[PDB]
Design a protein around this nucleic acid. Structure first.
Ligand SMILES: [Cl-]
Ligand SMILES: [Cl-]
Ligand SMILES: [Mg+2]
Ligand SMILES: [Mg+2]
Lengths: 405, 405
DNA sequence: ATTGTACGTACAAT
DNA sequence: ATTGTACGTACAAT
DNA sequence: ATTGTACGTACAAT
DNA sequence: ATTGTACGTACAAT
């Protein structure tokens, strides 16, 4: 069945972390990140610690041997006290020396300090946080293994992509919708993906009130298609799918009407093909249930437009299911192609549920739903603890890299 | 897996009508009905019709050769006009000669006449109706084949029973609840079954208003247990299950409270064992869905007390499911036996979904739910068109035979 | 904040 | 009393 | 009323 | 326009 494509034309089976890691060592990742300085800063307050030295050695050898990123040096920067100003001084010191990314070790749980520093770094340079007190109580091998998956991704590398039939499925999938941060405030999102699970462009709205939802939903989607088209100017999108998700205002028929208008305007502006075939889907995580591989990829039809994908819960009697409801709220398909297109979009959602660059283990949740949830967590908490605002507009690094992992 | 037990200790696979019919011819039914007169009346208004003669010959030879009911003679009675009084004269003439049952051919669709005659016959003698205009447009072989399944059952025979492990499942299952006949009026029902799918006793309430529901629900259940116990005086019920169904007043917590009281009173009166283990289940047919034998008998857990059985739709791309929701609203099981008992009651419901004496083909709906629906259809329409009331109390034939098929 | 489970013991609601 | 959460700690993952 | 499907064409609701 | 019913006729079942 489905496989992951890594480097040198090799592919490895899904649902098998051991073979994925082994394949990376043999063949490299799908794309090794391009770096300016070949330099990574490690920033901590545990100078001469043995654990810091063990961590640095594993990072160094695995960046070389697993990720095939050669000639990297790691520089150390020591902050004197675990507070914002003292750590920020060392972050700025690291940036001044010329580094491709920062790995920042914090001593303990500290939510305001974390989100203030994280929002500063997201606006500055690819970064990876670590907790020393958790690091001290973990298998270092597993810790660094998965750590490097998302750090390499943050640096712009592509660890692996989905091996999918290039003749089936959408040209692009737009994950879009909004996420509430409280009873009144929200932000809209729109993320463009290839059918192989790679993210091409990201846009998010400013935080606004629910009264402004549909205005900013349309504008955020137009902005992400503009950015996708400018960065991919020869791509003619003839097969388009919207994956709408997020806890958002209940305005279903008004929202569908606006999403349809948006697609039509983008056709008018020739941002997608004038003959584009599209569908607008609602993706909702529903209540889990338990059957007391027969359901790996099973598709359930509830009505002509409501479907259910029985995604397996990652777990260690009963088989747990994490179902995903998929409703077709709008499409321009003909009756003759309709159920062929239903199978294709459902298979596509299943494939995308296997993409996750946070770590080696699949999340079994489509990236079009999962990655906005990660973004929501950061935007909400940066707002709550008053960090630096994150505005990907005008910042190509934020528009194209998975800074939210 | 599951098999049907027929005569002479033989058993045949489920879901295979051809082998079931062949097994009956070779081994006979599980129980051949006992008859007083060895005489069946055929009552029609098509004297000397060739089709009537073909029908009579198939009935005669199959009663002999498939059902192993020997030495039967069929007498004919001719009514002159298709009206109640003229047909009733021939029904009474048939009864006066001494017959074990009546087969009554009506010329066409006529709902008032059908239910007036049917309610008269149900109060008199086992009976089987037929429509001449439909009979003329059918494969006579298939028509008579299934016709005789339910006629033999109405005469008190047992065509086949479920082959079930005698050490698993309930001692008796009581199908109970109520069915609305309009927005205000209803009747309660209670049917006692063995785990092999045979009905032991039946009681129904008079038609009452919804305000009287819980009073008559309790009294109808007590009445059916009294009748089961009087007819089965050495049976010690230590494993009891209630299957509650029917479109009825929304009084869930009050209904559960009364059903629990009923079981406790019956324990007090020593109608069941004082150490009886029981569960009270709600069985609801839910919305069908389609998977786009992997679900023959599949059990889904939704919560600790809510389950789903994915019963297959009988049908001729997508696999249709007719799910059955099963909720445990009350039980006296211990925590240690609980999930063992959940599997047993769910398997038991699945087995009972294979019992259907209306014809050879399974209905894939548990008899504890299906047979009350058949009763509801008759009671409602006899009320609507003012036929003779059907009161099984005091009438052992109505309390023990499946007159509703 | 590598991430995710699994599972005690609490306490929340009815 | 009973049933869903809730919040810790434990620790698995290749 | 042997029963049950499957499926046109209508019309019902939005 | 679009999507669920609805009510006929057709006819399958072994
Ligand atoms: Cl569970
Ligand atoms: Cl369908
Ligand atoms: Mg991260
Ligand atoms: Mg019948």
């Amino acid at each position: 069945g489905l496989t992951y494509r890594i480097g040198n034309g090799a592919s490895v089976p899904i649902s098998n972390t051991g073979e994925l890691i082994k394949g990376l060592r043999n063949y490299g990742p799908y794309e090794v990140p391009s770096l300016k300085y070949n330099q990574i800063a490690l920033i901590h307050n545990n100078q001469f610690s043995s654990l810091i030295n063990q961590l640095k050695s594993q990072i160094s050898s695995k960046i070389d041997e697993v990720w095939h990123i050669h000639n990297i040096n790691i520089s150390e920067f020591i902050y004197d006290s675990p507070h914002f100003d003292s750590i920020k001084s060392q972050v700025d010191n690291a940036i001044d020396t010329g580094v491709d990314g920062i790995m920042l070790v914090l001593p303990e749980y500290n939510t305001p300090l974390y989100y203030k520093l994280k929002s500063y770094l997201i606006n500055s340079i690819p970064s990876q946080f670590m907790r020393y007190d958790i690091l001290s109580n973990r298998n270092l091998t597993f810790y660094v293994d998965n750590l490097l998956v998302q750090f390499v991704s943050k640096l712009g590398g592509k660890p692996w992509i989905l091996n999918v039939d290039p003749e089936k499925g959408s040209d692009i999938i737009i994950g879009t919708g909004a996420t509430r941060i409280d009873n009144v405030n929200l932000f809209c999102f729109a993320m463009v993906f290839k059918k192989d699970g790679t993210m091409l462009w990201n846009e998010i709205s400013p935080i606004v009130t629910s009264s402004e939802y549909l205005t900013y939903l349309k504008s955020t989607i137009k902005k992400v298609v503009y950015g996708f088209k400018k960065s991919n100017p020869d791509w003619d999108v003839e097969k388009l799918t919207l994956h709408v998700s997020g806890k958002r205002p209940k305005m279903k028929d008004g929202e569908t009407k606006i999403l349809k208008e948006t697609v039509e305007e983008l056709k008018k502006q020739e941002m997608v093909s004038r003959d584009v075939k599209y569908a607008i889907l609602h993706l909702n995580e529903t209540h889990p249930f338990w059957v007391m591989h027969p359901y790996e990829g099973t598709k359930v039809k509830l009505s002509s437009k409501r479907y259910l994908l029985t995604l397996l819960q990652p777990y260690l009697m009963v088989t747990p299911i994490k179902p995903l409801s998929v409703e077709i709220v709008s499409d321009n398909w003909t009756s003759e192609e309709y159920y062929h297109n239903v199978h294709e979009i459902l298979d596509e959602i299943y494939y995308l549920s296997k993409m996750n660059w946070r770590g080696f283990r699949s999340r079994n949740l489509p990236v079009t739903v999962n990655y906005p949830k990660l973004v929501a967590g950061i935007i909400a908490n940066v707002n709550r603890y008053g960090g630096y605002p994150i505005n990907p507009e005008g910042n190509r690094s934020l528009q194209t890299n998975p800074w939210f992992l």
